[model samples]
Target: KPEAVLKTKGYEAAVKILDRDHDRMVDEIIKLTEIPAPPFKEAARAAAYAEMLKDAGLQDVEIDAEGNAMGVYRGTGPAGGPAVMIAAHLDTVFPEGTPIKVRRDGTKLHAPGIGDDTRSLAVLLAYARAMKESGIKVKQDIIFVGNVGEEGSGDLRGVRYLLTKGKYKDRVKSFFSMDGTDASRIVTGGVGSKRYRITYKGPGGHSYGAFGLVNPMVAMSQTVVDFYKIPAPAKPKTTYAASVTGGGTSVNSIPNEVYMEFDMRSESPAELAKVEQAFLAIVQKSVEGENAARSVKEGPITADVKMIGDRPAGETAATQQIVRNADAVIRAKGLDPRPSFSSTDSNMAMSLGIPAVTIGSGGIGARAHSLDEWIDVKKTKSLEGATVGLGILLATAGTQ
Candidate 1:
């Protein structure tokens, strides 16, 4: 039980170490956050983090083939116990050239990518240090990962490799992705997403001269209107957004092509698929309707649907042992665990049926994925967050 684990001598020592090194952990966050980790380009940060893991006294520290920096804190047991993976994503939504120098005012640290995951990376290092210094041993091996490719187009490739092709794939039975700073939140569901760039193409001409011709803009607009009309479920929370649109030559010209990028998400695969199929039909119908209404003599308007992203939707049962362990740890920390759903690295693990959750590294934060993104690293909240993460890892991995 988490209560029993907390009462252990080693747990007490680890908590103390976390409290003592809180400032150092914040420094680590600032140092790592300054290194731009744009999507699929996490090599510098991963290399730096691998050294940090080594300095923390972890064994067999290495950057895997997938560019994920990972190390094992050997367990006391001989063999057969399930391995647990604790990870923080290395990539962020910000581009490579974006200024990431952290600006600190009191406890608040403002920088792009700082809170969304740089803080979590620092938390992983802190965990390694505290666990090693406190001499906490577990029955199962614990793998600490600073993985790449969690944001945007990266598509969870780093975790995908760890679970499917990495050396420890079969041994890792549970996963925890420290993604944000809300300690009360436990992400049990993976919000699957599907993104598409749909383009309608036709012959172009002057607006006044080719007024009756099949206009791609007209077909694209109809597709968007029809797409929003599709029913989305309240339960399981299915949603769609026609997020981006463009592709016009001039204001007074019948455009040859027009495009719209649509995003749809849900926690249910069936529901996602249902909406996806309905969307495809709507696109086709819109194109046909425009062609029939106008003169298609120049050329029939054709729809080009290209899928840009696909994240599988999945969930870990709330009653599962892993989830209960997380809950107990949070409750012990005097915070009510709020089970939630989000798209994170854990999505890959949840889809694979390995018990997994995305938890916060602690503290408070806002404006993730924006230039002014920030995290509050005051000692009280920082220490509590670190302590809570350590407790969950220990209880789930099982203290010896």
Candidate 2:
């Protein structure tokens, strides 16, 4: 799996240049974290990223049709070499109007969405600068994207659009998403997840008049029970959970309607399919039970299941070149690289047979979606570990 190797002399030179104003990197991270970028409302943040890319000396930096800030750095090699992409999502789980001010308490910066992606976005800018300043001529095209919608409701729209779009389809050879703050770990494979919403309906009547009538809530409860009874596999673990529920109005009245949301995840597609079939059967049984219990024979209880979200699980071979390269990077930085089974943008690429991995940026933080979320800037030095890790990937994979 030895692909063409790049002369690291240039890459080393580039890394030195990118690390300039050593403190400036931290300053930029703090500045980026102050901006609110909840879900679809990432225009401002995307624009800021576009500006940073331009300042990093990237050519043709522009916001795409989906508001992804992207730019290309041409390699000195001939055409047909694979193109490599590195991305960090621009959106956060925080809602709009959430105060996003970064407060420095001791060495930590407290905010709503600081560590989740703000720091990664800032590092992306630095990576771009490193490439530009280092003047390390690459052998393949490198596309840097600050994508929107990696968070909820985004449905991974930004990356999805880029991949499905005809223009860049043939050019992209690999993808890497930056998430979280664990530089010591890399997620190379994991489960694919699907989320669904189910609603049940039945005839409504007054408590006294409909005492024996079918109850949608009762049907929903039965479905939940049945769902839990389904056997899950141990290999490539599969599991399901009804995460949220809501329905009905008053206690005295028979509930005519009920709704619930459930999430299903599995490390293997076969396992996911098996569990999904069992899930559907439970929904059907619940409807049948409610209808049988109804006093009226006509227009029995009805159930509707709607898919809300789906992210396919993916896995790269343990011996894949990308996996090996990533492992090398982590070990080189004096860290242990462990196998992961989490969802991220890598799921999409890995599903398509494109080698991919999800890596972390440096900084310590907690309470990801809450107002109390905080990031330890002093811990940012650990980011150097990730920087070196990615540098290896870019150098190795980029040359091939």
Candidate 3:
């Protein structure tokens, strides 16, 4: 049973180390939070994290080509066996200029990017240190990664690169993303999202002068109206949104172009494709209707549909050994395993047929992606949360 790991002397010593250095871990998280790692601008944080990994006794620490900071902890497993990876994203949803100063309130550490992932980064460092000091060994290698780009627009670039093209591409066998702060939840399914920027273009003209012309705005608006009419399936939990839009000249001018960004998501790739087809058909129909109803002297309105993002939908079955180990660890740590579906860096591994799950680092937090994000560092609750993930990692890696 996975709980067998908890009975090991090495596991006990490692837990003690984490418990003894709990306050130090909080300090590391605070330091990480102060450094702004916004979107694609995660170099500063990634560089800092690489150094921290080295200090924690990890070997061969380096920032990869994709700007992902990583280090390897060698194991005694069979020579050619695949490695295990545990990662936390370096990027935050905040912009470059946003103030990331940490505000301390009792046991709470308040700051942008503080809880969403910075805390997990600190926890990762703590694990490395504990493993070194406690003399804990495993059967397979464990790689620690502070990845770039898990926030909006940045996508899952770091993990995708590591799995598909980076040095460790096919060598990583199982993956764990220390993302959230709640120890009770384990994310086994990756929610896929397809994002598009649809732009309707046509010749510009004064609204009064080209009153009968096909206005690009007309077609763009029609697409939005028709897109929402498609029925969304509740079984697979499919969803869609026409999030952002722009493009209009002046009130008196017929716009040369009008654009909208559409987003559709589902846990099932098949369901996601079903909605995507409907969306494309609506876009084409909107253009046809606009062209037929008005004069085409200045040219008919045409659409330029560009895909902005695509996150594959996939799942690591709940019955998998990795997932069962996670569930067992959480239960042994005095909590129920709340299996969830999330869009995180684990999405890359899940899509590639690797066993993966995104679990919490520790403690409790909320207000993710907001200016006042925070996480609590209360000793008892935080330590309890921390051990759950540590147990999962140790059990899955085969405690020795």
Candidate 4:
């Protein structure tokens, strides 16, 4: 079925034009990867992508107030059918001032944050250029975006802003986040994720004076142990972890404060909520027990929980038109597309029930968040081809 669609008159021509300057695609990938786009610090990379979109014949190319660069390619339909968006995040896990230079070793390019998103950012330009050069037009208006803040601390902020805070509220019919290295996988579901900072506070005193007092660190430790014991659903998938912890200065002092950052995730919102409710109850019990055992005059140890990051889970039926279309494209490209999951820009769109998936810009690499990160450019080219093919399918109204 997918092959039949891709074998249409203009499909082959479009793919050919997209791969015309294969070397240029590789060079662009290297160039864009050279710019450090750490979370919340993607202004320069965003600007660079905006200019590249202009060069690719995209109109009204501009960076939005939230620092998301977007441009439009008009369609033949005057009534503005559905707006399809293909996006790549510009931010990485690395902090500002991290070097992003690409080091060549044979066919691979080594650098921090090379293939995670920079490769996809460059591929977006290549797809735009091919469409323009081939003179291909679609019925649905296509929007190309270089979004920021999809990684850890960024918490998909750029995409969340675009969907909830920007001008295009619910106008998007389908969305795609370019975020993977495997071209054979398509992520159609979103995993709900919640990040929390739990803190315990009590009166501080010298070790001798506070020997019988309630210690905040003691309460926090109990809470962490309880959180680890929370039961998770077996079907939809669930996880919880107390990832980081910090507290007071000296070992001889009864610590007045202790804090731990924990993360919980599930493929289903219902399951995530169930686990969250249980965890909160554990925290409550820990605080109550700590206060009840205190030998000090203080009323009770105070516990506070703050939600640092919340990404709602999203899912599109396996039978949705967009899912079917993506499958068609993957099959047409001679690959089997398997459903997968990732925390990416698609989380923003899918949470709202918009059809969305996170695909890849091919490459093989290890240590995604370290200085030892590397990208296999040759394998990345396959991803470029897949994206170009997917672009054509989306442009043709799910036909091919």
Candidate 5:
């Protein structure tokens, strides 16, 4: 019956909405891309998105505590039915001071956040606008969201707030995250991650004066060396890495402080737990070995591991109704269904036992997270991705 529902008047209306409104969609994408939405600093974009939602006729448009742009799309047929969240992140990987400008080369756009999520963010407005302008009947409430804190250090904080915080907690029945740049990629799994900002501290002195004294750098070196030896499985794909480190005041100084961020990720919770224990053990042992090896009295060296990020791992089977409907709708929209496992905003909702998935924002993009990143939005390629995303949203939520 769900498959049969895809052929109804609403689905036909979707085709019409996506058809005549793509130019308007592309215009919004370019407009929003100019707003600097770097990680935790997404206020400008959030304010703009909330306005866009209100302008699109969403009544409950508001910014969440975590700085997410949210709007409630009132469903026509059902008042107390299930609510589905269709969203795209509002943050970009670029830093705040980075120049946010778009350069046009024919139909392609080159700039930061052009494809990764800027285009996807535009799709949020387009889909919601399409549903409202076309008056496509719906049986469930579809919430449109332009959530923030999804990039490098933000750690899905916007979506986390929505799902766990008091505002929209327990109100959402399912989630569909529209992100990335691909034609048929539908993410059905979340890759769990654990990140730590490690600090090794000690007293400071000149390099020559502190020659016989303790050095935080030495302890850090020991940790990095021993950390690589921790055994892990490749089946579920375990990975660990030290991202960045800095501390020395100068080349001649012994560096009073040193800190580095490390990340450990895996698909299996048990595997990550084991690796976590091993990682902590090495942290203590490395500090001990550094002090003991130096044989320096009053070593005055210590280390602390501060948690930076954590995302729960989860997945959905193809046999599940939501997933089945997702695949069916991809066909209904005339796009190939390419399902895979990856990390995204849906990971947060799925981790909380909600039926959630992620779909690509359609189009070809290369060199993501880089300054040279560009997206080809020529023709109907990019808009098609949003149509498919909206299509899946309509199908999975079901019609009256």
Candidate 6:
């Protein structure tokens, strides 16, 4: 087993090495950012990251079925005990063929996903290098992973598979996600998310000739209107959206089909269930009301609801050992840790009753998921954060 705890001088040496290795660390970030990692299309990047993890002294590095780059660092902990996970996701919000060339003006790097996640991957790499160089021994196995599918519509598939069915399974003890760019925020709760596609269908005909016939759009529109009237709470912050809307194929014809996509989110399971129940009921009422008119080309108007995504909701207690260690380490590193909540890779572990947290890589960034997103590389405070993150990881992987 690698030495589990680092002495004060060992910690200082690790920090000093990372501080002096800007070129190596930042170069990996640029090289990786240039690799297009659009959602579900993260195979190439996963393969590359796996190789890097292997080179960083990780054992058995490989890409899993979900395209997660995974490996293990053996520990001297008790036999048959749980292992700890340290991870960063490989997928980006950009779509296939999106421009990902890293642009540098001074120390600022511009790209589609330059900072939101690229920085975290960089920090993970740096953490590995420093730990290896410092020869720090660890008591528990450290599973380093770069998972896929963390962005919009990707729906946390990578981590979900890792925790539920991948190599770790019940043997994995805790989770640490290196995500985004802000070290100030420690995400401990997952904002529950549910999405659906609803479609209303009827017979088609000429608009003038089908004047008395039922309209799918009309029923859908009524449901949409009623859905907005659902009261939301202030504390849990319930929210709803009909982000995608489409209907008629031709202006002169009565459309046969109309469809809309919806997204509902909240921090509370009870609240989310309430909103979903209301939404389905409204749809049913609208369809019934439309058919009750008895003026249609074929029969009653029909609507179908298809669930697209369901990200589990879970909360990690602030008093958990992992959270306490992280908080203490961040404070010791001369930074105030701000605990917050979000939907991230940590969601799966949190839902599974595993200790988990998502921390930033430490930098200034903005415009995430957009073409103009950028990161301040030269002014980045991530090196310090990486030191703190590594310390927390080792501390969590404790010895007897």
Please provide, for model 4 over 315-357, each residue's C-alpha lDDT reduced to its tens digit, 9 standing for 90 to 100: 8788987777777777667677888766678877888888887
Candidate ordering by lDDT (highest first): 1, 3, 6, 5, 4, 2
**lDDT, candidates in the order shown:** 0.91, 0.76, 0.91, 0.78, 0.81, 0.82
Q: What is the lDDT of candidate 4?
A: 0.78
Model 4 stretches with alpha carbons more than 4 Å out:
1-3, 79-81, 249-252, 363-367, 379-384, 387-400
User: TM-score of model 5 relative to the true fold?
Assistant: 0.88
Model 3, 1-400: lDDT tens digits are 9988998999899889999999899889989989999899999999999999999989889998999999888899876478899999999999989988899899888899899889999999999999889998888999999999898988899999999998788788989999989888899999999999999998888889878888888898999999999888896789999999999979899888889999999988888888999999999999999999888898889999999998989899999999999999888888989998889989999989999999999898999989979988999988878888889998988867
lDDT of 6: 0.82
Give lDDT tens digits, candidate 1, residues 160-270.
999999988998898999998898889999999999999889998889988899999999999889999999999989999999999988878999988999999998888
Give the runs in model 5 whose Cα sits over 4 Å from its true position.
Answer: 76-81, 202-218, 243-257, 290-296
Off by over 4 Å in 1: 77-81, 205-213, 250-253, 291-297
Point out the higher-scoring one by TM-score: 3 or 5: 3
Clashing pairs in 2: 14-134, 192-313
Error (Å) of candidate 3 at residue 386 is: 0.7
Query: For every model in order, what is the number of clashing pairs?
Result: 0, 2, 0, 1, 0, 6
Whichever of 1 and 2 has more lDDT, that candidate is 1
RMSD of each: 2.3, 2.7, 1.6, 2.5, 2.9, 2.9
Pairs with steric clashes in candidate 5 = none
By summed lDDT, which 10 consecutive residues of candidate 3 come out lowest? 73-82
Model 3 spans with C-alpha error above 4 angstroms:
none
Indicate the worst ten consecutive residues by lDDT in candidate 5.
291-300
